[PDB]
Ligand binder design. Structure first.
Ligand SMILES: [Mg+2]
Ligand SMILES: [Mg+2]
Ligand SMILES: [Mg+2]
Ligand SMILES: [Mg+2]
Ligand SMILES: [Mg+2]
Ligand SMILES: [Mg+2]
Ligand SMILES: [Mg+2]
Ligand SMILES: [Mg+2]
Ligand SMILES: [Mg+2]
Ligand SMILES: [Mg+2]
Ligand SMILES: [Mg+2]
Ligand SMILES: [Mg+2]
Ligand SMILES: [Mg+2]
Ligand SMILES: [Mg+2]
Ligand SMILES: [Mg+2]
Lengths: 106, 191, 172, 136, 197, 193
RNA sequence: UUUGCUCCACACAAUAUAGAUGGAUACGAAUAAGGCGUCCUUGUGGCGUCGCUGAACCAUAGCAGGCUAGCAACGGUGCACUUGGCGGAAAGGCCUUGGGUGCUUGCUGGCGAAUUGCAAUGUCAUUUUGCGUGGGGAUAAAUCAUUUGUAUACGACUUAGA
């Protein structure tokens, strides 16, 4: 129809960090509609894509993707920790990100 | 200690009908109509019967409860002010220079004009507040009479006149000159 | 200090050769666990009798539950406490459904009104007030009147979402 | 010309006021106010609903419009008897409040297929209503 | 949730509104705030006037230009509360701040767009009743903001139009209601009712 | 330490910065408060400073030692040939302040004003306002609806006037154009004027 | 200064992007009070009803949504056109009339889909610009130099010149 979407929307928030030091190996993800750590336990291990554009066509597309997975829950409000094959660029704090429904346990 | 409920009673006479929505109060009676905004308070008015209205405060502190009675008073003086009405009498006081008091008008004014105070060449002017009527009392020496439905407006217009006559740069024990509020009462006789 | 339990604690001086079977004293102690409770016992015991833990022995420790946990009670409460500039005796009245809950709010009260921490307070007595109008303080008496009813004006519902499409209402 | 002073008529905390418990192991269950402890605390008993006689904070509970005759400090057996007598359950169930609750619980239980069926029906209901809307 | 979220500042507490706006920006949410002049600050008018004059005496001693700037407008008093909650000297901060717009009144297109509220910054939910508080418009006007009358005027005009709009809609939803109920009791209706609809 | 002797500072800090002005024609930063009961008139005028001279007149000042006596006084003289009206601008109120909504112009424009719109007159094809001029040739629709739009909106109304500098001994030839606020009554009456 | 400029239309090429992926879905005011319906004496009015969250409402089925037939309705909706009207706070958008046209999953049919091999964003958005085409539309100025002195350290300013 009008909606083709198979993933849940999300936001790249931060790197894992202290007050004064960050950890680019871990990204903190806000998943839409997940407000508690319990809700967020559903998504652990789900795979994440960050999709973007580039000028050079490569394998035939001008669209590229960084892949990752959700790893643990973060804090009380339903934020989630996730790692990616290569670390996310950090200009993407605030950028949208796609959480999929696979691998499925339902 | 947060008193759980304390309340007050507002007695309603046989001529008037008071109506309150939100905290806006309207009291209508023989002599006119007065309205007042109570929204700054947090009390709950309750009608019981046509001659009786209650005001109460729930789970209130000292300062809050203190404000209950004064709410009752304000609405009371509205009720009586709309029936009996209010009358403030003032007298002139001077030991040499006679104080000369008139009523002038500029552009729909009604100002109170005080001349020669302590010999002053300066002309003092206090505005007549809407709702108050000033009559220079016949048969009484240097008496001025302010009257109206609103205590607040009459008491204030009076005070305005008594203060415009304050005496600077003299011993105000020796120099007593002024226009002072000499009686407070109602418009209707008997009561 | 924590959520309190009430303990019976019984102790005695160690038996001597010439004084076997010494005299067995009991205290009722409010504490969050038996470790603190036994500590408190020796605390007050050394304030009364000639002993200390080293020469004494704990005979028995037992928790005492409320006899009627769902029944509302008016508690009279007696306390000694230290202020910055002196030490003082007090009497407060607390209304609640168990001794253990009453001592909870007492300790909260002393902290809030008189700035007394737990170390600075002695519970002298806690006893149920059996006849009303033996009830003294009026912040309690208030609640003993017949056919008692009150509203809860200006109600605030907690929002689960950062945005709302309505504007709220405090009606209740 | 009468007086006419407002209303502002609140739900009262009183013996026999029935409350909907908003959070806990009870949570969604009705109960009744037995005694009252202080301004923030009351004793509640929920026997029909299966909620244990207990002291509770008022803020954990939301006052309903329903009331029924209860002796202050009435025990559980008594409470259970007066409750059924007063028929408060059917009275609650009849309220829009309760109905709204049951409604959204049904929605949440919907199967993906059932969701699809709900859609085909709204399509159908929409067709005839929009029709009626154009004829008057 | 939405590409843009329009907040009607009326009856919101400055610092708490600022605090939630700042976070939304940094998370990539565009925000426009309207009716900034109808914003609130706790404390009575005089305290907050005095606090503004406190802020007013700070200036670079050798050149008052390099020194701190004092913006008098309600939207700008707001933007200050907000900008201090953003790390505004970083690319990331400047990025988040460009997602923001503040306005006194409700200017075009936003006037015909829906606006929302923030229950955790809402004064009437937040402030304990009886506490004294302050309206931003009156504060600003006392420190030199020139436009309070022009805004109030335009708003009163805007408010008349919006009333007709509302009236026409309330009437239309009265037909839609009547039609919806004439369909009630039919098959499709009772079937939807079963499925929770 | 401290000054050791006190003296007032030098010069007024309200006149900073002390710099060349942005133009020879100083800007009118304020106009008289509008009283809309009076007939429509200009609130200002343009002219050129010729010079000064001396005057003798009797002084009427009761109480002064020179009451009823003659005094001699210096005066300036500014040359003020009639100004000419080439246009109107309406202004509307906004939360950001006054802004100009539209400007309607006269159909014919003196070369004195046309000159003002060029930095090189002799070389130019002098095309200024030529297309604008045409809007009059049609029934006048466009010019009316602007004139019309001024009335509906517009808190304040100003006329565009210029000087006839050719009536002046000056060598210049390039006239001076400026906006003057109309303080006579009734915004609609104002534009009509 | 080698056929330049602009607006509309498509065409190719680049260039990008603080981050589309069903819908930013419009009273105002009060909160110790209100929304909605209804009646009327049109009021600070009578009666009814609601809240306790948008967990809503709307939309949503079809090769990323192909090719086709019919029925019931007279409804919905897209698009380009036409009628009348409204909006200046930054209006640059809103409403209305009328015919044309496409779609309709309101209901009932016929055909298609594979082999992209068990997942690999599997590409559908909108920014700016450049090069030719042809449909309208338009045919200037500024600067240097010279010159004035209401100006000026130099620049700048202010005059003048077919
Ligand atoms: Mg460090
Ligand atoms: Mg003195
Ligand atoms: Mg003296
Ligand atoms: Mg659902
Ligand atoms: Mg100073
Ligand atoms: Mg000195
Ligand atoms: Mg225009
Ligand atoms: Mg970028
Ligand atoms: Mg209505
Ligand atoms: Mg009514
Ligand atoms: Mg809704
Ligand atoms: Mg289709
Ligand atoms: Mg088919
Ligand atoms: Mg804008
Ligand atoms: Mg071309």
């Amino acid at each position: 129809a009008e909606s083709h979407r198979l993933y849940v929307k999300g936001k790249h928030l931060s790197y894992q960090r202290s007050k004064r030091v960050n950890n680019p190996n871990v990204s903190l993800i806000k998943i839409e509609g997940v407000a508690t750590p319990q809700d967020a336990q559903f998504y652990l291990g789900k795979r994440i894509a960050y999709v973007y554009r580039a000028s050079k066509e490569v394998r035939g597309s001008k669209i590229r993707v960084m892949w990752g997975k959700v790893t643990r829950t973060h804090g009380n409000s339903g934020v989630v920790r996730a790692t990616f094959r290569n670390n996310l660029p950090a200009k993407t704090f605030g950028a949208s990100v796609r959480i999929f429904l696979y691998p499925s346990n339902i | 200690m947060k008193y759980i409920q304390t309340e007050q009673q507002i007695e309603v006479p046989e001529g008037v009908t008071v109506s309150i929505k939100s905290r806006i109060v309207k009291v209508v009676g023989p002599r006119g109509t007065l309205t007042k905004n109570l929204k700054h308070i947090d009390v709950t008015f309750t009608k019981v019967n046509n001659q009786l209205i209650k005001v109460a405060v729930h789970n209130g502190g000292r300062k809050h409860v203190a404000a209950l009675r004064t709410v009752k008073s304000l609405v009371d003086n509205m009720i009586t002010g709309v029936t009996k009405g209010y009358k403030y009498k003032m007298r002139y006081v001077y030991a040499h220079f006679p104080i000369n008091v008139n009523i002038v008008e500029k552009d729909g004014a009604k100002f109170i004009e005080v001349r020669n105070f302590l010999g002053d060449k300066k002309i003092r002017n206090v505005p007549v507040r809407d709702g108050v009527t000033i009559e220079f009392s016949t048969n009484v020496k240097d008496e001025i009479v302010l009257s109206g439905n609103s205590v607040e407006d009459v008491s204030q217009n009076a005070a305005d006149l008594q203060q415009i006559c304050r005496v600077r740069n003299k011993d105000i024990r020796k120099f007593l000159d002024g226009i002072y509020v000499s009686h407070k009462g109602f418009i209707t006789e008997d009561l | 200090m924590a959520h309190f339990k009430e303990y019976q604690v019984i102790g005695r001086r160690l038996p001597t050769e010439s004084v076997p079977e010494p005299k067995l004293f009991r205290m009722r102690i409010f504490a969050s666990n038996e470790v603190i409770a036994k500590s408190r016992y020796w605390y007050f015991l050394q304030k009364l009798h000639k002993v200390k833990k080293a020469s004494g022995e704990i005979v028995s420790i037992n928790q005492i539950n409320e006899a009627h946990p769902t029944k509302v009670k008016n508690f009279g409460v007696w306390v000694r406490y230290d202020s910055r500039s002196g030490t003082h005796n007090m009497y407060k009245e607390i209304r609640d459904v168990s001794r253990v809950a009453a001592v909870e709010t007492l300790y909260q009260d002393m902290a809030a009104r008189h700035r007394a921490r737990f170390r600075s307070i002695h519970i002298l007595k806690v006893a149920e007030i059996e006849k009303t109008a033996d009830v003294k303080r009026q912040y309690v008496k208030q609640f003993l009147t017949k056919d008692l009813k009150f509203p809860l004006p200006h109600r605030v519902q907690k929002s689960t979402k950062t945005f709302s499409y309505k504007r709220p209402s405090t009606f209740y | 010309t009468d007086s006419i002073v407002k209303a502002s008529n609140w739900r009262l905390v009183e013996v026999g006021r029935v409350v909907l418990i908003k959070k806990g192991q009870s949570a969604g269950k009705l109960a009744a106010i037995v005694e009252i402890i202080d301004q923030k605390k009351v004793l509640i008993d929920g026997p029909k609903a299966g909620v244990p006689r207990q002291a509770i904070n008022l803020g954990q509970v939301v006052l309903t419009p329903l009331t029924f005759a209860l002796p202050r400090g009435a025990r559980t057996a008594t409470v259970s008897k007066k409750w059924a007598a007063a028929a408060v359950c059917e009275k609650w169930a009849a309220s829009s409040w309760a109905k709204k609750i049951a409604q959204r619980e049904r929605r949440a239980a919907l199967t993906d297929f059932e969701r699809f069926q709900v859609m085909v029906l709204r399509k159908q209901k929409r067709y005839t209503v929009k029709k009626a809307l154009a004829k008057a | 949730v939405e590409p843009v979220v329009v907040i009607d500042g009326k009856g919101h507490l400055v610092g708490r509104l600022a605090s939630v706006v700042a976070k939304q920006l940094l998370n990539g949410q565009k925000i426009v705030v309207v009716r900034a002049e109808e914003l609130n600050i706790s404390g009575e008018f005089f305290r907050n006037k005095l606090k503004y004059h406190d802020f007013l005496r700070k200036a670079t001693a050798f050149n008052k230009t390099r020194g701190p700037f004092h913006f008098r407008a309600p939207s700008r008093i707001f933007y200050k509360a907000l900008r201090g909650m953003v790390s505004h000297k970083t690319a990331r901060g400047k990025a988040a701040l460009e997602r923001l717009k503040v306005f006194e009144g409700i200017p075009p297109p936003y006037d015909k767009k829906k606006r929302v509220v923030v229950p955790q910054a809402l004064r009437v939910l937040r402030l304990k009743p009886g506490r004294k508080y302050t309206t931003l418009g009156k504060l600003s006007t006392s420190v030199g903001w020139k436009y309070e009358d022009v805004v109030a005027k335009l708003e009163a005009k805007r408010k008349v139009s919006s009333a007709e709009y509302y009236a026409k809609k309330r009437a239309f939803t009265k037909k839609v209601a009547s039609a919806n109920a004439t369909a009630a009791e039919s098959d499709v209706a009772k079937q939807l009712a079963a499925l929770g609809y | 330490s401290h000054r050791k002797y006190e003296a007032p500072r030098h010069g007024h800090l309200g006149f900073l910065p002390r710099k060349r002005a942005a133009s020879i024609r100083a800007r009118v930063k304020a106009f008289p408060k509008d009283d809309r009961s009076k007939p429509v008139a200009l609130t200002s005028f343009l002219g050129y400073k010729a010079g000064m001279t001396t005057i003798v007149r009797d002084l009427d000042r009761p109480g002064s030692k020179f009451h009823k006596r003659e005094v001699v006084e210096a005066v300036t003289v500014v040359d003020t040939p009639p100004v000419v009206v080439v246009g109107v601008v309406g202004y509307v109120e906004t939360p950001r302040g006054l802004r100009s909504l539209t400007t309607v112009w006269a159909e014919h424009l003196s070369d004195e004003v046309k000159r003002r719109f060029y930095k090189n007159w002799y070389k130019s094809k002098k095309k200024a306002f030529t297309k604008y001029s045409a809007k009059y040739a049609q029934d006048g629709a466009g010019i009316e609806r602007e004139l019309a739009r001024i009335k509906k909106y517009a808190s304040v109304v100003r006329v565009l006037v210029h000087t006839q500098i050719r009536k002046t001994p000056l060598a210049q030839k390039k006239a001076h154009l400026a906006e003057i606020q109309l303080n006579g009554g009734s915004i609609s009456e104002k534009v009509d004027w």
